[PDB]
Amino acid sequence: MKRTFQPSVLKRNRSHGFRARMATKNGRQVLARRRAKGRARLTVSK
Amino acid sequence: MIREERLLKVLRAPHVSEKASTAMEKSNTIVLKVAKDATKAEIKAAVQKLFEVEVEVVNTLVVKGKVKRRSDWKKAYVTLKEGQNL
Amino acid sequence: AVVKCKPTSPGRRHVVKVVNPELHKGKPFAPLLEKNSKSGGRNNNGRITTRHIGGGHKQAYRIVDFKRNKDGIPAVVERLEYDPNRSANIALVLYKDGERRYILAPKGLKAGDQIQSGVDAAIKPGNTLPMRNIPVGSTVHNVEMKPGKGGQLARSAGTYVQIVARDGAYVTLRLRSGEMRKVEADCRATLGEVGNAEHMLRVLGKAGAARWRGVRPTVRGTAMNPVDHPHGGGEGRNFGKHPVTPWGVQTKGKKTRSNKRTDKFIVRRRS
RNA sequence: AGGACCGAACCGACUAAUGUUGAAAAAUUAGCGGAUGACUUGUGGCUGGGGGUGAAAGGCCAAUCAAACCGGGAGAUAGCU
RNA sequence: GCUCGCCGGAAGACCAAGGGUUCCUGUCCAACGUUAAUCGGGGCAGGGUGAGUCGACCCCUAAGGCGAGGCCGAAAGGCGUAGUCGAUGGGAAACAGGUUAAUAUUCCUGUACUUGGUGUUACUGCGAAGGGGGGACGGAGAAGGCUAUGUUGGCCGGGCGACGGUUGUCCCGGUUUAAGCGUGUAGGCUGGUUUUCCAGGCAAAUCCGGAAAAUCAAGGCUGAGGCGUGAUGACGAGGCACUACGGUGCUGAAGCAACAAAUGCCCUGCUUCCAGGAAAAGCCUCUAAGCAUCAGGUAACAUCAAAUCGUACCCCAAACCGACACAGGUGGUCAGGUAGAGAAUACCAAGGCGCUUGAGAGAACUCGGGUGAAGGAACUAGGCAAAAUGGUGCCGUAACUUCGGGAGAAGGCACGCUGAUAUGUAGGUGAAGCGACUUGCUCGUGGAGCUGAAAUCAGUCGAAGAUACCAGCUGGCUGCAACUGUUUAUUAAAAACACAGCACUGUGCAAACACGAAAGUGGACGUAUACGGUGUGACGCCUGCCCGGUGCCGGAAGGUUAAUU
């Protein structure tokens, strides 16, 4: 059967990528929390 | 005109392998692990000056460094005209 | 002419179509076309603001001259064309200086006819004049509401407006609704009625024929659950309530016009 | 010509059996319905939680839905166990 | 290695997406792999991806996103103009052979093509974020002309048969060749060429549009395929050598015709229909400001430049999504033979596989099948399940009906092979020849050769001839919903929802109404034959009485009645 994850790099980057996080202040707050936690990977950008 | 210093930094290691020797013996194609930013023009001029030979064309490819070690490098297939290089 | 299709299948049994052999068969006039992308009834917030809109056939917009500003130059009618953006059909007119335009086709118009606009134009169907220069009692269409704005009233297929009185700077019109209205006498109008009056006689015949006009199915309020509509649930078919819109306003009688800015121009409301 | 007909792909899902610590957190097998249309599909986009979307079933909105998920108020409160 | 089975519109081949080195070689067998493993998509080492023409980038735009100013909104921020991004779409050019252990339109061989820069020469009006062309567009249907491709014949090479026969209407194999360049024909579209004039194309134009006049319609665009050349080249059945028997090296015949052919091409065509079918740039053309013996434009030649990134491998799957080497899911391209209407189905080709535990035995019972005497729905909640029917042609076919249907109604009959009609018919194709011409990619005439149903008559075989696979059960009486459709992803497909039609009601456009503190936007670039909301639900015949009550609409004389004063 069809499962929920149907990957697509373009959609992934447009939805959760670095430039998408930086576009709004809430997304910029997501990045600040992840920097405070010390995450090795900030975003899905690769 | 590309500067000499730039040309000195495009040539890193003469690639030695089975396919390397095969190409050199067949179409006089010297193979060289060059810099990953070295453009065709850069490699051509560098080999024609530092190795002082004649280059027909460069057929460079970027080799994806295998994980757990190798970093990403560039294999230039510097086809020479008749100038015997390495 | 209205034609009944033979019942060679259900979905054809009750189809009545209005075929017009005078309508041009080729492509429309390219310089007068633009793209018209569909909306689905969604605004710039992306939300459905008008229900039951979506799909249908792709359509190109034809720029129709509603102002009729080219005064004093005669025009001849080249052909009648089908227009998918309205119930009426349009006419391609060639002005004597060599410029073409689209107008709403009046009732009796046909290829070869001569039309003209301005103060001194003759009183014939298809001619556009200020209503100051049109005899009282005339039947006109594509009527301006403000001088120079362009025609707004009586634009549908078989519609027309009657000039019933002229009192100073205003004329009184009888609208298709039956409403009596006042407009400035400097507003323009076109003599005659809009053609294609057989439009109202067509029968779609099947559900799909409405789907490809861009109309989506209407679900009755009483068929939903109470969370979705004031006509809520019930075990079986229950109503027990006064009819209302999905947002709770009493339909079936309650008047909704509230415009004090305009009330001065309504001589009589429709009945 | 046809929301025509029969019937592969395709899209579905009426019945029976099997499976029920499954080959599978809904499938397999045998049949079954539509199959030029209110058709199906690829790729992008858009609508956000008392909100969306709904040919309307309280359906669906990432195996979650008569109010998603995550984190916070928070050690809510619990005459009950 | 030899047999055997299995897929074959796939279980073959090539990709996109996604993955990420899984790819090739050498080594190892702890763990991994539902067993062993000497093997592996496992471990370790080393290699492997070569592009002016393929793709991306790039140019251009759709939906949509963002958005200087700007307009709004306690703040955060919303919307949006100029603009700028954004493919799933439009913009330039390479083919065939050969080669690696693993890369090829990328390397090599041969033969091409495109765009741009810069010089020389010759001739010259050039010049926009501006005008006009063009790009540029739906569904359905029907030819006709072709090709891919196939079959047979001819040709060439080989063969003469483990068992009766096999020097022949015998057997096996091969009979390939491209981009480009030249020609321009089956077809499609359109009258052409001059001259004069102008209320149009935000200005002006020699371009587009319009109006007259003259004179020839005999012109031009477009266009598959064929033919020529590429190419005396390459490839080529097989032979002859070396050999590590892997495999490498050398040489190399014929390389034609007829018929049948697509869902591919002509065709973005043609005919019809209503539901009336993107945009912008590249491209062509016109001028403005401006430039003036410059600069620019056109053509020829020469020369140079075409960067950067991707290229391995899987890709209906053991490499992607499903926790698994999971009976599931997953878009595009290609598609050979014999039967067949077929991309169904059976069996095969090319290729690819036997599904990572096996060996015995031959109990009950379970699963998945085959067949059954006599009965024949007695079963059961119910024919659930099974069994049955099943093709083509012809004959024949009731009630009822909205005249279309019902209807494959029902029910019958003939089907194989052989021979003759006719050493292969009707039909299809069509060569030479023969004439013609406005003389070759021409047109008639002629019928060689090839292909080829269907029928009738006669005969013959089995129990059976639509012999397999494939492939309607039928009829009678009723409830409901008109109908095709839609739904409770994962126990409900229905009489439910939708529906065409009907009615009511609201709405005069800055519409009602909706999403929005707002700004705005949808409705709608629509405008009362238009839109919204409600109920009913094709069609036919129809829809009675009641305004008490509760809404809604109208009226307002009087009573009561807020802030305020």
Residue numbers in the entry:
A (entry chain 6): 1 to 46
B (entry chain t): 1 to 86
C (entry chain c): 2 to 272
How did the manuscript describe this experimental structure?
Within the wider vestibule region, the uL23 and uL24 loops were shortened to lengths consistent with those present in eukaryotic ribosomes with 7 and 11-residue deletions made within the uL23 (23ΔL) and uL24 (24ΔL) loops, respectively. To further explore a molecular basis for the observed earlier folding mediated by the shortened uL23 and uL24 loops, we used 15N-labelled RNC (L = 37) samples to derive structures of 23ΔL24ΔL 70S ribosomes using single-particle cryo-EM. In silico sorting of the 680,941 particles yielded two major 3D classes comprising of empty 70S ribosomes, and programmed ribosomes harbouring a P-site tRNA-bound FLN5 NC. The 23ΔL24ΔL RNCs were resolved to an average resolution of 2.75 Å, where the truncated uL23 loop is observed at high-resolution (local resolution 3–4 Å at 3σ) relative to the uL24 (local resolution >4 Å, at 1.8σ), which is decidedly more dynamic. There were no other significant structural differences in these ribosomes relative to the WT 70S ribosome, suggesting that the loop modifications only altered the local environment surrounding the site of mutation. The structures of truncated loops in the empty 70S ribosome were identical to those observed in the FLN5 RNC. Following loop truncation, there is a clear increase in tunnel volume (calculated with POVME38) by 1272, 1736 and 3008 Å3 for 23ΔL, 24ΔL and 23ΔL24ΔL ribosomes, respectively. This suggests that the additional free space generated by the truncated uL23 and uL24 loops correlates with the extent of enhanced folding of FLN5 on these ribosomes as shown by NMR. Here, the absence of the uL23 and uL24 loops generates additional space within the tunnel, thereby facilitating a shift of the most probable NC pathway towards the centre of the tunnel relative to WT RNCs, in which the NC’s trajectory is diverted around the two loops. By contrast, the NC ensemble distribution is more symmetric in relation to the centre of the tunnel on 23ΔL24ΔL ribosomes where more contacts are made with H7 and H24 relative to WT RNCs.
Co-translational folding is a fundamental process for the efficient biosynthesis of nascent polypeptides that emerge through the ribosome exit tunnel. To understand how this process is modulated by the shape and surface of the narrow tunnel, we have rationally engineered three exit tunnel protein loops (uL22, uL23 and uL24) of the 70S ribosome by CRISPR/Cas9 gene editing, and studied the co-translational folding of an immunoglobulin-like filamin domain (FLN5). In E.coli’s 70S ribosomal particle, the tunnel’s unique geometry is shaped by the 23S ribosomal RNA (rRNA) and the ribosomal proteins uL4, uL22, uL23, uL24 and uL29. Of these proteins, uL4, uL22, uL23 and uL24 all have extended loops (ranging from 10 to 25 residues in length) that protrude into the tunnel, and along with uL29, have surface-exposed globular regions that crown the perimeter of the exit tunnel.
